[PDB]
Write a protein that binds this ligand. Structure first.
Ligand code: K
Ligand code: MG
Ligand code: MG
Ligand code: MG
Ligand code: MG
Lengths: 196, 204, 231, 241, 222, 244, 243, 250, 195
C-alpha cells in the first residue's frame, strides 16, 4: 500500500491506492482502503488486510456504542481506540493505520499509528510501503491551509509517484473529503494520474 | 515417525449390483518388524461396516468409540443406524479433533435397509467425506489400490464376481507395499446375508 | 428486632443493627487512650486478664517504624486489621519508597471495614482502633470505628468508661497539645487521662501498656518494669 | 407467604413480584403515546418537572438506543436507564456480530427475553418498567414494539402507556375505526406529531405548553427527539386550526 | 480447486470445479465445493476440504437459528461477518478460502473471504489454485450489465480455464444461480467435459481365480 | 439474603430421618405399581400405567419400562421426567464400562452407581432428591439373573420378587404367598399379572393399562434376549392366563 | 407483609422499602449542597464538631474524582467513599480508552447505574447516601444529585441531609433573583450563607464549614478547595446575614 | 452479589406433592385452549389468538412455531416462557443432533430434549418450573407422524389427539367422539376447527385463530432447487384466508 | 529395562524379563524384577523410560487391586488388558506421556485358557502366542516362528525360552544379566529360581 491523509483550510482529505497482494500477485486491484469508523471519522489502512479490517470493525463498534451514550466522539478519541487495540496486541498485529476526522471545533485532524501502536498527531501523514518514495516530494510540497483543489492535487501527485515506484501499490486513487459540507468520495483512474 | 505409516495396513470398499464389498489386510507391524498377522481392520455396528487404516491404537480407539456411540443411538432411536447417518457421525467425530486428530483413514460400507441402496464412503484423518459410486481406498498402499481399482473395476458386478475383483485389487496392491499384507479378509454384503472370506496370500 | 439478622438489612429508621452490635463489643472492651502534641503521639492502654493465673491481653500493635495502634473489642479482628495495615505500610515502602501517610492509613481501614457492612454472609469487624503515627505532616492520632468511620483527633479514648478520659482530654486540650520535645510529660498526661476511667482497680506494673511515636522516636511499646516509672 | 417475595408460583399460578413490578410502572404518573405515519413513527410523552431547581433539559424518559431505534420508558428512571444502557449495548453488539442494524422488533424480543429470565430466576428482580421501541425498519417500515416486566412483547398499530392509558387507547381505537387504516395517512412527520398531540389532548382533557411534552420521531435512517421550540412550533400549528 | 463468482443484472452466480487432491493423487473426482448456508445464500470453497465444509455448516447452522430468531430471511453480510470473524479468530489455521454470494431483502451480493479473515467486494472474483487461470478469463471477458445467461457462460468458462490449465483442478463444473425474486437453482454437474473413455478390456476374472483359506457367515442380526 | 427461602433439602429430622427422602417415598406410593419376579430361566417385569385416557397413543408409548442396555432393563415408579435423567446417566455408564473393559457391565455395578447418584442428592448440593424408585432386571455371567430395587435414599437391595409404587404392602404379601424357587418364567408371568389384577385400584386390568417385559435365555444357545411386549402381545398373554 | 425485610423485593405498592429505609439514613446525615453558576459549580457541606478534640480542617469530606469533578454526600460516610472509589475507577477507565476526561453527564450515569445495581439483589444493601456532584467539561458546567434508588437529575441548585428543606428554599430564591446567572465567587459566598442557614436544623453542636468549586475562569476548569482568605471572606459574609 | 440461590425452589411436601409443578399446571389451566389432532397423512395443531388490545397486531405474535422443517409447536399457559423454550428447542435440535448427524432429529428425541430442559427447571437451583404445557407435532422418516404433550414436570406422552388449557376437559371429550384411526388430514383440520369453536367466545375467523399442519413436503417453500433428496418442509402455517375458506363449509 | 519376552503354551503363560538396570556406563543392579502381579492369575511385565515404568506398573496394580476388593472378584485377563490399553491410549496425548511398553500374561479361570497380551506405549494391543518388546523381537520372533507349537507343555515352553535367551546372549550388544522367569497358570503365579 501507499496511503495518506492531509488537513487543509476546510477540513481533511484521505487518500489511498487500491492494490492488495499475496506476493507479487494482485489479489484485488480495486480495494477500498479508506474506511468509515464514524460519520466524519475515517481511516486509511495499511499492512495485513485481515488485521486492519478486524481492527476497524472493532473501532466502529466502539464508536457506535460511544455515540449511543455520549454523542459524537472526537477524532482524538477514535485514534485512542485504534491505539489501544494496536498497542495491546502489538505482538499479533501488522497494521499501519492513519486516522482522520472533521470536528466543527477542531476542524480537520490527522493521527498516524505505526506498527508499535504509538500515536502521532500531524498536519499530514503518509504510510504504507509506497510512502517511502514520496517523503522527499511531500515534505517539499505540503503547505498548511491549502484549498480543497490544491489538497486534491497534492494527494493526487503524491500517490501517483508512490504508485509509480512501489510495485505493491497501484490501481485507482481513491480519496475521501471530510468537511462541514459533508462527505465526498473521489476516484482517479490510471489514464489521468500516470501522465502527471 | 509418521503416525499413519508406523503400523501399516490397507482397506478397500466396492459397490456391486445390490451388494457391497469391503476388504482389509491383517498385518500389524512396528515399522520393519511384523508383529501380528491377525489384526483385522474391519468392524461392524448392526449392518453398517467400518474399516479403519492408519495408527493401530487409534483404529482400536475409534472402533470402541463408534460401538459406544451406535449403542446409545440404537437405545434412544430404537433402530439400527444407517450408513448415510453413520457416515455423518464419523465426520463429526473426527472434525471434533481438528487440531489434534486421530491418524486414521476410515471407510464406511453398507446397504441402506430402507431404500436397499449400496453405500460406500471414505474420510481423511479430519473428517472430510469422500463419497463414491464405485470404490473407496485407504492405507499405506492407497496409490496401489487406486491403480488396481481404477483399472479392474466395472459397475454392477454380481456378488461372486465382485469378490474376485476386490480380492485381486487388495492382494496385488498389498504385494507392492512393504507394510501391507500378511493375510487378508473380504466381506461380501447383501441385503440380508454377509459372507466373510479369508484369502490365501504370500506371507512376506 | 426483625432487622438485625445480618448486616445487609436496614431498619425502618435507617439503622444497621449488626454494625451497632459490633460497636457494642468495643464498649465491653478494656479502656485505651490516645493523645498527641506537635512532636509526639502517645497511646495508653489498660490491659485485661482472665484471672490472677493468666497473662494480660496485649492491646497495642506495631504496624511500621512510624505507625501503630491500640485495640478495644475483638482482639482477633484487631490482628486482621493491623496485619492489613502492616501490608499497606509495606507496599508503600517497597513500591514508592514512601512512608504511608497516617491519613491514608485511615482511609484504607475505612474502606476495608465498609465492604463488610454491605455484603451478605460477612460480618462487621468487632473492634475499635486508635492509630498513632508520625509522617511528613507531623504527629497524628486517628480513631477507627468498625462502622467505617475514621476520625482525626488531638486526643480520644475508646472502651468501657472511656467517657471519663475523653472529658479529661477535652479539658486538658490546650495543655497537652503544646508538650513538644518532651516524651515523658506527654505520657504522664496520657496516664492521668486513662486514670479517669478506672474503678476499684489501679494501674499496676503488669497492667499498664504505653506506646509512643514521634519526630526522633520510632514506634515503641513499653510493658512490665519499663512502665513502673509512670505509676 | 414467601411466594410473594420472589418469582415463584403462588397456589393460583401467579407471580406476584411480576404483578407488583407492573404497578411500579405508573410510579412516575406519566402517560406516553405512539403512532405510525406513512414514512415515520412518532412517540410522545408527558414531561412533568415539579421542582424549580431541576435542570429541565436533563429530565427525559425518551432514549436514542441506536441511530434508527428510539425507546420511551414508563417507570422509575433508575430502571429506565438500566434498560436503556443494556438496549444500547445489545444493539451495538448485534451490528458488530451480524453486519446490519438491529431491527426494532428483534431488540424488543431480546429485551423481553431478558425480562422473562428475571421472572424465572430468583436472584434477579424484574425491572419496574414498560419499554416502547420505535423505528422505521428497513424491512417492516414504521414499527412500534412494546415490552413489559412479564417478558411479554408485541407489535402495535399504535399504543399508549401510563395511568390514563385506557382513555388514550380507546381514543385511538375510535380513530382507526373511522379512518379504516393501520396508520396516520400523512406525508410529513410534522403533522403526525400534531396528530399525536391533538389526540392526547382530547383523551387526557388537558392543554399543553412547550415544556409539558416530550417528542421522539423515527424516520428512515434516523431517530431524533424534538427541542422545546420544535414542539412550540408544533403547538402553534394546532392552535391555528 | 478453481472457484469463481460473477454478478449480473438481477442477481449473482457462483461456480466451481469438482477435483479433490491428496498431494499429486486425485482423491475425489466429483466432490461438491458449492455449499448451502441458507436457501438463497451459497458458498464456493477452496482450501482444506474438511475446513470449508465444517465452517460453512457451522455458520449455516447459526444462520438458520438467527433467521428463526429474527423472523427474517438471512442476509449475505451476516454470513460474511460470521465467517470472517470465525476465520480471523483461528489466525489462518482453518484453511478455508470462500466466495460468499446470495440474494436477500437488501439485494444481491458477492464477496470473498481469505483463511486469515480478510473480505473483498467485487462484481467478479476467483479463488483457489486455479484462480489465476480463471481470473485471466474474467479480466478478458467481463463487462458491466451482464445478463443471467451471459454470467453463467462467463463463470463456467472461468472454471474451465482452471480445469484445463491447473493441475489442482479438474473433472466437472458445478454452478449455482441466485436471482432476485426467484428460488436459487443449484446446477450440480452443469458441465461434464471429462468423461472417461471406454476401457480397452474387461478385467472380470474367472470365478475361482482367488485362493481362499476360510469361509464363514457373519451375524448382523441381534 | 437468600437463606430465608432455603428449604434445606439435605437435613435430618430429630428422629434421624431424611425429610425429603421420606416425602419422595410418599409421592412414589401413589405411582402405578410395578412388579419384578425372578425365575430360574428368566425375569419378568410388569407395570401398571397411571389412569389412562382412551385417546392416549398406546403402542408408541413408554412410561414404565426402559431399556438400559441389551442385558439390563428397569421398571419405573415416580416422576417419569426424573427417571429419564437417571436412565440416560445409567445408559452412558454402561457404555463407559464396555468401552473400558470390553465386557458388558455387571448388573450390580450399574445399580450401585445409579444408587450412589441418588445418595449424593440427599447429602449435598441443597437440591431436591429424585422422586423415583427403580426395579432393575438384568443378566450377567457372574450371578446370572438378578432383580434389584433402588429408591430416593440411594439404598438398593436384591430380590427374588419385589414390587414398587402403589399397594406394595398388599402386592408383597401376595408374591410371598405364591412364589417358590424352582419357578419358571411362564409361571412368573402369571404371578405378576395375577398380583397386579388383585392390587389394582382400577375396576379391571386391561391390555391398554399395562407395560410388560421379559428377560429370558430363550434366544438360541447361551445368550439373553429382551422382549418389551407390544400391546397385542399383552392382550394375548392376558387372555392366555384367563384374566380377560 | 415482611416485604421490607429484603432488598430488591417489590411491595404491593410497587416500592422497594429497603431503598426508602436507606433514604432515612440520608435524612439523618449532615447538610450538603451544590450551586451551579455561570461557568462552573460550587459544593459545600456541614461538618458537626462533635468535640474540641477534632482537629480543625483535617477531616475532609468533599472528594475529588479525576481532576475536574467534585463529590459531596450526606448519610453513611463510608458508603459515600465506596461510591467515590468506584467513580474514580469509572473515570480512569473512561480516560484510558477514550483519552478525554469523563464528561459530567457520562460520569453521572456511571454512578447511577452502580447505585441502581445495588437495588437489584437481596445479597447487597442499598447505598445510605445521597451524593451531590458535578464539574466542568467541554459543554460547560453541570450539577447532579444522586439518590439511594439510583435516581439522579441535573440541578440548578441541590441540597440533601437534615437541613435540606431550609437549604432548598434558600436555593429557590437565588434561582428566581438571578435568571441571567450567578458568578463563581458569588456562589461561594451564597454557599456559605446557605450552610449557616441550614445549620439551624442541627444547632446543638456548632459546626465547621467546608467549600469547594470548579470554574472555567476562576479555577481553570479544575476542582479546588476553597481555603484561607477566600474561605474566611465567605464565612464573614455568612455571619453578617444570620444577624 | 452473584446467584446465591443454589438450592431447589421446588421441593416435596409431606403429602408427596411437588408444589411448584402443581401450581405451574394451574397456570396452564388458566391459559387459552390449544389442541392437536393426528391424522393418517398428517398432524394439525391449533389455538385461539387471544388479542391483548385491538390496537395490537396479533400477526406479530405467533403462538404456533416452527422448530424444525418437520416439527411444530403450540402451547397453553405463559407466553414468555413458551417463547424462550422455542428459542432453546430450536437451538438444541442443532447442537445436540444436526451438527452431529447432519439431519434433523426425530420428533420423539427433540421432545425428549425439551422435556429435559423443563425437568431441570424443576430441580436446579434458584429457578421456578416453566408455566406451560406444549403440544409438539412432527414427522420423521422412520416413525412417521406423531403428536406429543410436554408438561411442566418434564413428562411427555404421545397422543392420537388431545387438548390443553382453558376448556381442555370438554375439548378432549369432543375429540374422543370424533377421532378414528382412518382420519385424513383435511378431516382432522375440520374437527380441529369445530373443537376450537366451543372454547372460543368472541370472533371466530382466520385472524383470531392460529393453525398449522405437519403434512406433505412443500417444495415451493424450500427456497431452492437442484438437490433431489431435499424436498421441502412438512411444517406449514395456514394463512388467514385458508382458514376462512374452511369456515364456510363448516 | 530392555528385554521382556512372553510365551503362551497349552496350559500357561511364561514371562521372561531381563535383570539388568543400567544407567550411563554402569550396571547399577543385576537382580531387578521387571514385573508386577495385578491379580492372583494376572502378571504384567514392563520396559521403557526410567521411572515411568514402575510408576505406571504400580498405578495399574493399585487400580486392579481396588477393583478386586470392591467387587470381591478377579477381572479377566482380557478385561485387565483393555483397561491397561485405554490408560496408555489416554497417556499418549497427555502433556507428558507414559513411555512404557508392557506384556500381560494371565490365566482366565472362566475359560481355563492362558492369554498373552502385548501393549506398547501408544496403546497398541494385540493377543499373541508369543510376544516381545524392544530389540528382543528382532531375534526371538523368527526363532519362535520356527520352534513354537501351540500344544506345548510348560516344560517345553521353558526349553523354548532357554533357546531365546541363549540367542539374545549371543547376538545382543548389551549384557542384560540374564532373566527372571515366571509362570502363570490355573494355580496362579510362581517364579522359577534356577534359570
Ligand atoms: K469436496
Ligand atoms: Mg505500481
Ligand atoms: Mg507386502
Ligand atoms: Mg426473581
Ligand atoms: Mg505393539
Amino acid at each position: 500500500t501507499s496511503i495518506m491523509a492531509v488537513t487543509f483550510k476546510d477540513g481533511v482529505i484521505l487518500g489511498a491506492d487500491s492494490r492488495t497482494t499475496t506476493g507479487a500477485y494482485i489479489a484485488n486491484r480495486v480495494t477500498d482502503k479508506l474506511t468509515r469508523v464514524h460519520d466524519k471519522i475515517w481511516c486509511c489502512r495499511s499492512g495485513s488486510a485481515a488485521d486492519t479490517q478486524a481492527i476497524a470493525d472493532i473501532v466502529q463498534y466502539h464508536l457506535e456504542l460511544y455515540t449511543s451514550q455520549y454523542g459524537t466522539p472526537s477524532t482524538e478519541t477514535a485514534a485512542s481506540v485504534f491505539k489501544e487495540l494496536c498497542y495491546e496486541n502489538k505482538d499479533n498485529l501488522t497494521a499501519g493505520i492513519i486516522v482522520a476526522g472533521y470536528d466543527d471545533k477542531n476542524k480537520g485532524e490527522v493521527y498516524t499509528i505505526p506498527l508499535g501502536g504509538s500515536v502521532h498527531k500531524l498536519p499530514y501523514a503518509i504510510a504504507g510501503s509506497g510512502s517511502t518514495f514520496i517523503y522527499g516530494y511531500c515534505d517539499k510540497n505540503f503547505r498548511e491551509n491549502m484549498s480543497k483543489e490544491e489538497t486534491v492535487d497534492f494527494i493526487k501527485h503524491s500517490l501517483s509517484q508512490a504508485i509509480k515506484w512501489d510495485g505493491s501499490s497501484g490501481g485507482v486513487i481513491r480519496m475521501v473529503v471530510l468537511t462541514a459540507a459533508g462527505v465526498e468520495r473521489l476516484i482517479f483512474y490510471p489514464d489521468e494520474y500516470e501522465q502527471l | 515417525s509418521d503416525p499413519s505409516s508406523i503400523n501399516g495396513g490397507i482397506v478397500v470398499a466396492m459397490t456391486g449390483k445390490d451388494c457391497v464389498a469391503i476388504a482389509c489386510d491383517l498385518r500389524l507391524g512396528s515399522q520393519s518388524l511384523g508383529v501380528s498377522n491377525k489384526f483385522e481392520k474391519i468392524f461392524h455396528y448392526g449392518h453398517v461396516f467400518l474399516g479403519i487404516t492408519g495408527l493401530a491404537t487409534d483404529v482400536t480407539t475409534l472402533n470402541e468409540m463408534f460401538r459406544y456411540k451406535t449403542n446409545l443411538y440404537k437405545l434412544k432411536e430404537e433402530r439400527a443406524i444407517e450408513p448415510e447417518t453413520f457416515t455423518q457421525l464419523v465426520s463429526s467425530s473426527l472434525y471434533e479433533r481438528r487440531f489434534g486428530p486421530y491418524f486414521v483413514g476410515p471407510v464406511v460400507a453398507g446397504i441402506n435397509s430402507k431404500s436397499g441402496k449400496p453405500f460406500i464412503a471414505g474420510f481423511d484423518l479430519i473428517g472430510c467425506i469422500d463419497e463414491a459410486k464405485d470404490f473407496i481406498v485407504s492405507g499405506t498402499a492407497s496409490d496401489q489400490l487406486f491403480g488396481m481399482c481404477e483399472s479392474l473395476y466395472e459397475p454392477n458386478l454380481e456378488p461372486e464376481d465382485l469378490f474376485e475383483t476386490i480380492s485381486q485389487a487388495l492382494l496385488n496392491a498389498a504385494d507392492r507395499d512393504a507394510l501391507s499384507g500378511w493375510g487378508a479378509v473380504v466381506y461380501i454384503i447383501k441385503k440380508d446375508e454377509v459372507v466373510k472370506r479369508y484369502l490365501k496370500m504370500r506371507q512376506d | 428486632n426483625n432487622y438485625d439478622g445480618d448486616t445487609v438489612t436496614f431498619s425502618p429508621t435507617g439503622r444497621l443493627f449488626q454494625v451497632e452490635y459490633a460497636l457494642e463489643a468495643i464498649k465491653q472492651g478494656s479502656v485505651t487512650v490516645g493523645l498527641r502534641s506537635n512532636t509526639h503521639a502517645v497511646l495508653v492502654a489498660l490491659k485485661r486478664n482472665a484471672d490472677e493465673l493468666s497473662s494480660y491481653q496485649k492491646k497495642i500493635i506495631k504496624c511500621d517504624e512510624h505507625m501503630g495502634l491500640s485495640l478495644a473489642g475483638l482482639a482477633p479482628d484487631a490482628r486482621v486489621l493491623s496485619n492489613y495495615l502492616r501490608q499497606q505500610c509495606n507496599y508503600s515502602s517497597l513500591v514508592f519508597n514512601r512512608k504511608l501517610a497516617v491519613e491514608r492509613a485511615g482511609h484504607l481501614l475505612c474502606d476495608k471495614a465498609q465492604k463488610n457492612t454491605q455484603s451478605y454472609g460477612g460480618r462487621p469487624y468487632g473492634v475499635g482502633l486508635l492509630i498513632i503515627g508520625y509522617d511528613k505532616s507531623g504527629a497524628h492520632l486517628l480513631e477507627f470505628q468498625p462502622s467505617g468511620n475514621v476520625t482525626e483527633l488531638y486526643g480520644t479514648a475508646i472502651g468501657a468508661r472511656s467517657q471519663g478520659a475523653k472529658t479529661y482530654l477535652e479539658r486538658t486540650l490546650d495543655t497537652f497539645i503544646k508538650i513538644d520535645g518532651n516524651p515523658d510529660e506527654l505520657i504522664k498526661a496520657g496516664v492521668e487521662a486513662i486514670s479517669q476511667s478506672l474503678r476499684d482497680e489501679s494501674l499496676t506494673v503488669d497492667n499498664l501498656s504505653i506506646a509512643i511515636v514521634g519526630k526522633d522516636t520510632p514506634f515503641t511499646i513499653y510493658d512490665g518494669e519499663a512502665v513502673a516509672k509512670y505509676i | 407467604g414467601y411466594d410473594r417475595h420472589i418469582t415463584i408460583f403462588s397456589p393460583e399460578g401467579r407471580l406476584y413480584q411480576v404483578e407488583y413490578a407492573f404497578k411500579a410502572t405508573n410510579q412516575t404518573n406519566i402517560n406516553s403515546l405512539a403512532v405510525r405515519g406513512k414514512d415515520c413513527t412518532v412517540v410522545i410523552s408527558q414531561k412533568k418537572v415539579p421542582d424549580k431547581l431541576l435542570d429541565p433539559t436533563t429530565v427525559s424518559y425518551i432514549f436514542c438506543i441506536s441511530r434508527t431505534i428510539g425507546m420511551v420508558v414508563n417507570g422509575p428512571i433508575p430502571d429506565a436507564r438500566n434498560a436503556a444502557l443494556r438496549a444500547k449495548a445489545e444493539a451495538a453488539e448485534f451490528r458488530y456480530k451480524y453486519g446490519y442494524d438491529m431491527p426494532c422488533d428483534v431488540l424488543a424480543k431480546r429485551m423481553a427475553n431478558l425480562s422473562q429470565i428475571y421472572t424465572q430466576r430468583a436472584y434477579m428482580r424484574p425491572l419496574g418498567v414498560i419499554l416502547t421501541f420505535v423505528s422505521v425498519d428497513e424491512e417492516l417500515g414504521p414499527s412500534i414494539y412494546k415490552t413489559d416486566p412479564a417478558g411479554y412483547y408485541v407489535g402495535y398499530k399504535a399504543t399508549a402507556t401510563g395511568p390514563k392509558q385506557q382513555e388514550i387507547t380507546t381514543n385511538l381505537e375510535n380513530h382507526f375505526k373511522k379512518s379504516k387504516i393501520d396508520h396516520i395517512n400523512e406525508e410529513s412527520w410534522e403533522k403526525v406529531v400534531e396528530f399525536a398531540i391533538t389526540h392526547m389532548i382530547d383523551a387526557l382533557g388537558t392543554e399543553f405548553s412547550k415544556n409539558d411534552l416530550e417528542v421522539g420521531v423515527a424516520t428512515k435512517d434516523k431517530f431524533f427527539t424534538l427541542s422545546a421550540e420544535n414542539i412550540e412550533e408544533r403547538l402553534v400549528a394546532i392552535a391555528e386550526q | 480447486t478453481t472457484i469463481v463468482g460473477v454478478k449480473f443484472n438481477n442477481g449473482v452466480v457462483i461456480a466451481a470445479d469438482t477435483r479433490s487432491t491428496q498431494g499429486p493423487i486425485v482423491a475425489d473426482k466429483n466432490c461438491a465445493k458449492l455449499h448451502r448456508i441458507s436457501p438463497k445464500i451459497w458458498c464456493a470453497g477452496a482450501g482444506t476440504a474438511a475446513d470449508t465444509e465444517a465452517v460453512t455448516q457451522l455458520i449455516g447452522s447459526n444462520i438458520e437459528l438467527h433467521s428463526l430468531y429474527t423472523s427474517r430471511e438471512p442476509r449475505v453480510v451476516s454470513a460474511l461477518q460470521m465467517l470472517k470473524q470465525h476465520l480471523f479468530k483461528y489466525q489462518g489455521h482453518i484453511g478455508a478460502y470462500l466466495i460468499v454470494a446470495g440474494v436477500d431483502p437488501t439485494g444481491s451480493h458477492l464477496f470473498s473471504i481469505d483463511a486469515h479473515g480478510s473480505t473483498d467486494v467485487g462484481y467478479y472474483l476467483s479463488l483457489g489454485s486455479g484462480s489465476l487461470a480463471a481470473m485471466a478469463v474474467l479480466e478478458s471477458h467481463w463487462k458491466q450489465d451482464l445478463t443471467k445467461e451471459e454470467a453463467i457462460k462467463l463463470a463456467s468458462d472461468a472454471i474451465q480455464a482452471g480445469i484445463w490449465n491447473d493441475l489442482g483442478s479438474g473433472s466437472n463444473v458445478d454452478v449455482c444461480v441466485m436471482e432476485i425474486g426467484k428460488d436459487a437453482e443449484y446446477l450440480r454437474n452443469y458441465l461434464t467435459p471429462n468423461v472417461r473413455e471406454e476401457k480397452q478390456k474387461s478385467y472380470k476374472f474367472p470365478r475361482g481365480t482367488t485362493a481362499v483359506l476360510k469361509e464363514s457367515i457373519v451375524n448382523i442380526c441381534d | 439474603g437468600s437463606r430465608r427461602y432455603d428449604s434445606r433439602t439435605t437435613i435430618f429430622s430429630p428422629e434421624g430421618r431424611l425429610y425429603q427422602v421420606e416425602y419422595a417415598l410418599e409421592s412414589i406410593s401413589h405411582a402405578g405399581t410395578a412388579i419384578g419376579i425372578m425365575a430360574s430361566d428368566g425375569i419378568v417385569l410388569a407395570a401398571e400405567r397411571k389412569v389412562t385416557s382412551t385417546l392416549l397413543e398406546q403402542d408408541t408409548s413408554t412410561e414404565k419400562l426402559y431399556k438400559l442396555n441389551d442385558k439390563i432393563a428397569v421398571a419405573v415408579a415416580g416422576l417419569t421426567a426424573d427417571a429419564e435423567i437417571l436412565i440416560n446417566t445409567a445408559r452412558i455408564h454402561a457404555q463407559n464400562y464396555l468401552k473400558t473393559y470390553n465386557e458388558d457391565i455387571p448388573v450390580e455395578i450399574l445399580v450401585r452407581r445409579l444408587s450412589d447418584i441418588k445418595q449424593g442428592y440427599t447429602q449435598h448440593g441443597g437440591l431436591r432428591p429424585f422422586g423415583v424408585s427403580f426395579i432393575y432386571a438384568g443378566y450377567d455371567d457372574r450371578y446370572g439373573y438378578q432383580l434389584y430395587t433402588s429408591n430416593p435414599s440411594g439404598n438398593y437391595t436384591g430380590w427374588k420378587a419385589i414390587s414398587v409404587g402403589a399397594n406394595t404392602s398388599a402386592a408383597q404379601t401376595l408374591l410371598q404367598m405364591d412364589y417358590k424357587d424352582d419357578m419358571k418364567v411362564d409361571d412368573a408371568i402369571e404371578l405378576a399379572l395375577k398380583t397386579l389384577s388383585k392390587t389394582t385400584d382400577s375396576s379391571a386390568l386391561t391390555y391398554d393399562r399395562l407395560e410388560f417385559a421379559t428377560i429370558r435365555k430363550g434366544a438360541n444357545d447361551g445368550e439373553v434376549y429382551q422382549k418389551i411386549f407390544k400391546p397385542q402381545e399383552i392382550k394375548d398373554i392376558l387372555v392366555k392366563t384367563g384374566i380377560t | 407483609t415482611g416485604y421490607d425485610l429484603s432488598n430488591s423485593v417489590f411491595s404491593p405498592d410497587g416500592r422497594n422499602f429497603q431503598v426508602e429505609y436507606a433514604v432515612k439514613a440520608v435524612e439523618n446525615g449532615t447538610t450538603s449542597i451544590g450551586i451551579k453558576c455561570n461557568d462552573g459549580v460550587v459544593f459545600a457541606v456541614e461538618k458537626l464538631i462533635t468535640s474540641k478534640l477534632l482537629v480543625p480542617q483535617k477531616n475532609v469530606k468533599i472528594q475529588v474524582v479525576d481532576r475536574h469533578i467534585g463529590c459531596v454526600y450526606s448519610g453513611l460516610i463510608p458508603d459515600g467513599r465506596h461510591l467515590v472509589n468506584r467513580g474514580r475507577e469509572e473515570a480512569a477507565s473512561f480516560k484510558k480508552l477514550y483519552k478525554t476526561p469523563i464528561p459530567i453527564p457520562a460520569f453521572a450515569d456511571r454512578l447511577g447505574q452502580y447505585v441502581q445495581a445495588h437495588t437489584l439483589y437481596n445479597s447487597v444493601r442499598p447505598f445510605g447516601v445521597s451524593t451531590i456532584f458535578g464539574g466542568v467539561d467541554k459543554n460547560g458546567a453541570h450539577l447532579y444529585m444522586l439518590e439511594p434508588s439510583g435516581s439522579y437529575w441535573g440541578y440548578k441548585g441541590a441540597a440533601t441531609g437534615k437541613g435540606r428543606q431550609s437549604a432548598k428554599a434558600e436555593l429557590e430564591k437565588l434561582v428566581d433573583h438571578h435568571p441571567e446567572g450567578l458568578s463563581a465567587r458569588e456562589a461561594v459566598k451564597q454557599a456559605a450563607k446557605i450552610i449557616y442557614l441550614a445549620h439551624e436544623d442541627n444547632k446543638e453542636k456548632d459546626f465547621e464549614l467546608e467549600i469547594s468549586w470548579c470554574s472555567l475562569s476562576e479555577t481553570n476548569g479544575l476542582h479546588k478547595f476553597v481555603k484561607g482568605d477566600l474561605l474566611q471572606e465567605a464565612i464573614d459574609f455568612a455571619q453578617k446575614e444570620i444577624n | 452479589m452473584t446467584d446465591r440461590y443454589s438450592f431447589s425452589l421446588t421441593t416435596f411436601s409431606p403429602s408427596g406433592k411437588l408444589g411448584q409443578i402443581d401450581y405451574a399446571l394451574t397456570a396452564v389451566k388458566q391459559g387459552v385452549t390449544s389442541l392437536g389432532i393426528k391424522a393418517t397423512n398428517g398432524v394439525v395443531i391449533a389455538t385461539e389468538k387471544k388479542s391483548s388490545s385491538p390496537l395490537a397486531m396479533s400477526e406479530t405474535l405467533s403462538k404456533v412455531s416452527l422448530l424444525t422443517p418437520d416439527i411444530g409447536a403450540v402451547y397453553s399457559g405463559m407466553g414468555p416462557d413458551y417463547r424462550v423454550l422455542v428459542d432453546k428447542s430450536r437451538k438444541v435440535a442443532h447442537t445436540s443432533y444436526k451438527r452431529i448427524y447432519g439431519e434433523y432429529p426425530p420428533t420423539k428425541l427433540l421432545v425428549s430434549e425439551v422435556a429435559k430442559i423443563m425437568q431441570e427447571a424443576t430441580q436446579s437451583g434458584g429457578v421456578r418450573p416453566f408455566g406451560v404445557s406444549l403440544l409438539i407435532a412432527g414427522h420423521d422418516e422412520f416413525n412417521g407422524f406423531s403428536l406429543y404433550q410436554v408438561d411442566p414436570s418434564g413428562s411427555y406422552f404421545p397422543w392420537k389427539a388431545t387438548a390443553i388449557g382453558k376448556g381442555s376437559v370438554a375439548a378432549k371429550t369432543f375429540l374422543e367422539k370424533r377421532w378414528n384411526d382412518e382420519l385424513e388430514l383435511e378431516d382432522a383440520i375440520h374437527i380441529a376447527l369445530l373443537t376450537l369453536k366451543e372454547s372460543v367466545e368472541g370472533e371466530f375467523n382466520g385472524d383470531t385463530i392460529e393453525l398449522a399442519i405437519i403434512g406433505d413436503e412443500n417444495p415451493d417453500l424450500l427456497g431452492y432447487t437442484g438437490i433431489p433428496t431435499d424436498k421441502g418442509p412438512r411444517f406449514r402455517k395456514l394463512t388467514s384466508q385458508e382458514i376462512n375458506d374452511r369456515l364456510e363449509a363448516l | 529395562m530392555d528385554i521382556i519376552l512372553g510365551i503362551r503354551v497349552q496350559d500357561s503363560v511364561i514371562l521372561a524379563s531381563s535383570k539388568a538396570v543400567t544407567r550411563g556406563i554402569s550396571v547399577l543392579k543385576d537382580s531387578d524384577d521387571k514385573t508386577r502381579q495385578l491379580s492372583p492369575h494376572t502378571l504384567m511385565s514392563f520396559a521403557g523410560e526410567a521411572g515411568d515404568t514402575v510408576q505406571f506398573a504400580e498405578y495399574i496394580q493399585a487400580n486392579i487391586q481396588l477393583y478386586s476388593i470392591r467387587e470381591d472378584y478377579e477381572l479377566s485377563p482380557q478385561a485387565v488388558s483393555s483397561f491397561v490399553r485405554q490408560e496408555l491410549a489416554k497417556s499418549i496425548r497427555s502433556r507428558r506421556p507414559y513411555q512404557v511398553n508392557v506384556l500381560i500374561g494371565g490365566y482366565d479361570k472362566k475359560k481355563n485358557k492362558p492369554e498373552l497380551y502385548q501393549i506398547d506405549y501408544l496403546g497398541t494391543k494385540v493377543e499373541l502366542p508369543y510376544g516381545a518388546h524392544g530389540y528382543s523381537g528382532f531375534y526371538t520372533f523368527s526363532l519362535l516362528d520356527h520352534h513354537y507349537r501351540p500344544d506345548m507343555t510348560t516344560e517345553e515352553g521353558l526349553d523354548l525360552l532357554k533357546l531365546c535367551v541363549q540367542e539374545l546372549e549371543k547376538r545382543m550388544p548389551m549384557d542384560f544379566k540374564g532373566v527372571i522367569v515366571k509362570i502363570v497358570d490355573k494355580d496362579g503365579i510362581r517364579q522359577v529360581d534356577d534359570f
